[PDB]
């Protein structure tokens, strides 16, 4: 209907208007379910326009936003509490580090372009923009923290910047918005005979909101405040493909570890408590205060404990016993007077903090947690498990990486470098390459190469009878046809 | 927990801050401001001393001129003029005027107050009986000024100036919560409240609200009343603008053309303010929500006629209090607590000392905490101290204050209904 | 500068004011959340601030201290309490040792300008300035301590100085700030239609306010005193990007170890008292003395008490029993007389300090702690943990490094050697390198080479058939082509 | 003024009232009526007609006994409505039979 | 239907649940006749409460009373509430007024 938010959003609204216009003429209609696999929550509409001046929108947003971001908050704050634990933190650290590593005198994640362009110049512009995006995120110094948040908090998102008077040159660094502050929506803007399939483009806009009024832990006096509708074009975001049994209940990778982490630490405490409680000696002095009114009977009790009570304490700063000179007595000598030759009184000792373990369950649970956190078994070469883990790492990276594509296509569109269709035609593949630890890469490369050499060695006697050299090269050394020709030519030159 | 249905509380109203007044941050209590008043008549500080410059008064056109040689007869009730002579009169407004008599006539012998005399003189002026006049001094007189060639009693008129000042003082305000432990504990168990922090909020809030409300009231208190004097339509109701009375709307009917009448009067009042202060056309209005609803629903630009919904300026008092800018010219604020219906206009310059009304904070919202050991119940509260003041010359009627020193703080005598920077309008008939 | 408050720091005020204004001039706008990634606490002010002079700053600090930094101070004290214990402090020692390498007849952390700059003359000036920073800090002798404190408390701060008579060459020795005394903040200097998203230069100032009037530890006779507001430019600081679930309440890596550090301390002491208690003998006498006032019965109680009490101690200075001559009887003969007609008077024994362990939980917890302190599991060739710690350390160094980059640009810019714009374009790379343990570096490199040699050796028989020697150098020996040519040219020379 | 939370943001009105709203311009203009082409008044398809002036949500009280309109304010918080519907139990089916003759 | 478009819901998990409310109150007694709600939307704040209100008393205006120039008298209108007014003029106010409507 109309633009009714701060003017700073106007250029993003314009982008949204164009995208929506494309949705209006879109022939991707006659679809039963909302056209979305994950992320944004669905809403119905009051009309075929679903008009709302950015304020009225909140009637239905509130309905679906309560608890809304609050359950997102329960999950994330839990994820942080989880991460805060030792032997959780490490799982996160290793995973995040393998996804994003840093090395001396070299590059960091980079755009890798091998598809046709109108000019190398265009390729260069894309690569140059990619570099500025990294500079904006300060990826080269802080990239691993952005990833960690994505991995752990399950999602990450940033606010894009436009001038806005000279939007072409207004491209500036992204402000990471704090986790738990957003939730995405989508509207059914059309109807038929109860439940249509037609033109529901949905827009797919999102809400930002920071209800800092809840317990203000450590002086949380300020935060952004009451919810606002955002044009979508303005946000860079990503999340894991992990959900609950239904809806859009997005969870983090760490979600699986929530259970064992808490029961583990609870058990570690159960073990400590078992052994601290009862740690000292323990005994009840029973005092016969009979033939006395209660008001005075207590004085006999007080007298006896004042002369009998082991008023002795252990100094945890210096391993000594306070005021017990000389250094060690031969015995603890105590006398009780009985009121007759009748055993009314007594000294009743109690069970101590015995070494019952057998501390085996903790071991079980700790190992379970290490696995819950997606830690490879060797932690606490290329093997099936190391490889599985490596697959996991690149898959995470190939989801995370959207974070550098979204602002990239945005900048290229703003500069008049690429059109939307061209971008969509290019990818396909404009993938982003991450660096690997060369130490391990070198070892992995030696692996298999060693086998190939041993295989050639064994195969050798049949080189003149069963196996051609081309065959040895392509089937044992796994060389390509081009690679073989190149190696043959290099050798001919090397001959002299 | 028998299905607790959440809870409610009131929202906190917003404020107009100090957007339309001086802010003078202070680093000490009791500051001071001084001023220079160009003056003439050989004694800068004297009864009857005359200021060289003033927004409401004309200059003495014959001071360096012929008046140096001779006195002019004054106009007075019942006297008769002589054709060709020149009479002098200092008006209550428009100041020094020299009038040549075109006729031999008398002036309102029944006049009493200067206001009545001024009125008849104005009529005689309109009539063409009395005409504004000035001339220099015959050179043959000037030739011997300062006693030359045996002459006497011929000094030149002199000028100078008088510097004087005004000072302020900060008054303060404080509040406590005086709450209990048991209540706070229950609240923690009901809503999860801290029940000290919420109170802290309330107290600090109330203090800030009071101060801002006080500033607005001081604006209303010192502002002059508009639709009066030089801005008055003679057939009008004196200070109040209606919609049910054609005199204020030039016979309008048809809201698309009628509502614009108010905008017209607003400009007149804003312009008169410039006339009063010598600084510039008013640049801000604060008004009842009903006034604003009208402003936001009329095309305030220049056009044939036009009416629609109240969408031109925010009208709520729930998000803000600042409605927007009227015509791109005046900052519009909503008097969310207006007692009746009306609107005050005024001018505030880029110079913080150019505002008429000044706020000058020194101490603010200092928290205080402790507990009384007799029952150990907590005590908490907050303290603020600031002081306000008014512009020297805000009255404008007087060219100068008594004793070369005055309080810069408002008082009835100092400014009620006198401040050159602001004018009041009563509104009825919406 | 509305008022010349603390004119002592006017040069710093000028620097911050300059930066603040330049930030305002720039379109650092259209940002939803305050553009603060990490570091010092956030606070909001009104449009056009309306929150000055420094007295307003004190409002910020109270709100940010009472419920805020006061906790931070507890955390600082906690880190010290943590480090005060053993099996903790040594982890720190290991980290510090690896973090900063000190070796004979070599260099120490040094600025290395091997990337493009205007000229060698400028580079030389920068290198001299770097050296003076180290000289100011006596880093080459006290660098370990500077770093240790940074790591342990998760934050280092140093007060900078300008002459100011001839401020151009004003940087002189830096002064470490006392821990816990100063709070840093960033205020949002803006407001709009409910929720500003525009530019603020954020103040970036800090306030010192402690007093020995209230002790965290006695023996202290100096502190900050009242609330002193000093501009950000005035200081040099760094910290780890580690915070709690909310706010800016900065924690250290060692935070993770607090839990187990104390669980271990607690178990250690519990074990000690479990075994110490009841080591001596233990016995309670019950005497059948009835029908007497205490004033009479006491004689009978003393009759027994001063006869049956083995009034001796074990001399722990010299292993002997006091007055026990000869050294030990073959028996201790005791006696008691009874007054009633039943065997009621007796002496009970208590069970004694026996040994029930199974002392294994404490071991488990100690291991968990040691790990929690951020250490390799190789401790009580080349492996993954060592590589992991090399990475942990380069990050600690990378972050710590600001301790030099900050005063370096400050004095370079102050004198005028380089400009601010140049600094921002130049780094990128103005990197400072830390020395690496040459012993271990050689060993690592040697193993890498051994593997490379072995693979070359294996390839050898096939070089003239399938693998060109150029290729083997490229893939097996991991050489560049320039390196290959260099080796070929040097060989030709060796042969002559 | 009476809630301090927000100005009316929804209009509920009779079919005749909406016919008028639909046939008057809402922006600021010289004059305007025309045909009732905006804010669809056809209760067959909806209740919601449109947003008045881009500011208020206009609904149709298709059962008004005589002819009136009413306005009101709903905030972005279920509490700020004044009126609340609380479906402790809702739209729960009953299914069974009476075995004497087995009718369902 | 538009049955829930403008209502709150706050579904219950029991029948006959309960809602709480918090009212800021000033004047030393949270529950008393004459107690004032600090942020009531219909009434202005007591601008003197933290200031002169604790310094001196402000007698209320009443029918038949007369002011002294320079003094200050208070009152609370039924609408807009609390006010303090200076006596710029010596006046008396309608001795025949009774109900607040007349006095206001």
Curated annotation (Swiss-Prot), chains A, C:
Keyword line: Capsid protein, Coiled coil, Host cell inner membrane, Host cell membrane, Host membrane, Membrane, Viral capsid assembly, Viral contractile tail ejection system, Viral genome ejection through host cell envelope, Viral genome packaging, Viral penetration into host cytoplasm, Viral release from host cell, Virion, Virus entry into host cell
Organism superkingdom: Viruses
Keyword Coiled coil found: yes
Comp. bias intervals (Basic and acidic residues): 486-496
Keyword Kinase: no
GO cellular-component term (any): membrane
Coiled coil feature spans: 472-496
InterPro entries linked: Portal_Gp20
Pfam families the UniProt entry points to: Portal_T4
GO biological process terms held by the UniProt record: symbiont genome ejection through host cell envelope, contractile tail mechanism; viral genome packaging; viral release from host cell
Regions that span the bilayer: none
Places the protein is found: Virion; Host cell inner membrane
Oligomer status and interactors: Homododecamer. Interacts with the large terminase subunit. Interacts with the major capsid protein. Interacts with the capsid vertex protein.
Role noted for this protein: Forms the portal vertex of the capsid. This portal plays critical roles in head assembly, genome packaging, neck/tail attachment, and genome ejection. The portal protein multimerizes as a single ring-shaped homododecamer arranged around a central channel. Binds to the terminase subunits to form the packaging machine. Attaches to the host inner membrane most likely through interaction with host yidC and forms together with chaperone gp40 an initiator complex to form the prohead.
Protein family membership: Belongs to the Tevenvirinae portal protein family.
Full protein name: Portal protein
Swiss-Prot record, chain B:
Keyword Calcium included in the entry's annotation: no
Keyword Kinase: no
Subunit-structure text: Homohexamer. Interacts with the portal protein. Interacts with the capsid vertex protein that forms pentamers. Interacts with hoc; one hoc molecule associates with each capsid hexamer. Interacts with soc; this interaction reinforces the capsid structure. A total of 960 subunits of the major capsid protein forms the 160 hexamers.
Protein name: Major capsid protein
Keywords: Capsid protein, Late protein, T=13 icosahedral capsid protein, Virion
Modification after translation (UniProt): A proteolytic cleavage by the prohead core protein protease gives rise to the mature major capsid protein during virus maturation.
Part of the whole protein covered: 92 to 521 of 521
Gene behind the chain: gp23
GO annotations of cellular component type: T=13 icosahedral viral capsid; viral capsid
Family: Belongs to the Tevenvirinae major capsid protein family.
Biological role stated in the UniProt entry: Major capsid protein that self-associates to form hexamers, building most of the capsid in association with pentons made of the capsid vertex protein and one dodecamer of the portal protein. The major capsid protein self-associates to form 160 hexamers, building most of the T=13 laevo capsid. Folding of major capsid protein requires the assistance of two chaperones, the host chaperone groL acting with the phage encoded gp23-specific chaperone, gp31. The capsid also contains two nonessential outer capsid proteins, Hoc and Soc, which decorate the capsid surface.
From Swiss-Prot, chain D:
Coiled coil start-end: none
Domain of life: Viruses
Post-translational modification: A proteolytic cleavage by the prohead core protein protease gives rise to the mature major capsid protein during virus maturation.
Signal peptide residues on this chain, from the entry's feature table: none
Subunit structure: Homohexamer. Interacts with the portal protein. Interacts with the capsid vertex protein that forms pentamers. Interacts with hoc; one hoc molecule associates with each capsid hexamer. Interacts with soc; this interaction reinforces the capsid structure. A total of 960 subunits of the major capsid protein forms the 160 hexamers.
Function, as annotated: Major capsid protein that self-associates to form hexamers, building most of the capsid in association with pentons made of the capsid vertex protein and one dodecamer of the portal protein. The major capsid protein self-associates to form 160 hexamers, building most of the T=13 laevo capsid. Folding of major capsid protein requires the assistance of two chaperones, the host chaperone groL acting with the phage encoded gp23-specific chaperone, gp31. The capsid also contains two nonessential outer capsid proteins, Hoc and Soc, which decorate the capsid surface.
Protein's recorded name: Major capsid protein
Species, as recorded: Enterobacteria phage T4 (Bacteriophage T4)
Gene that produces this protein: gp23
Location of this fragment in the whole protein: 366 to 469 of 521
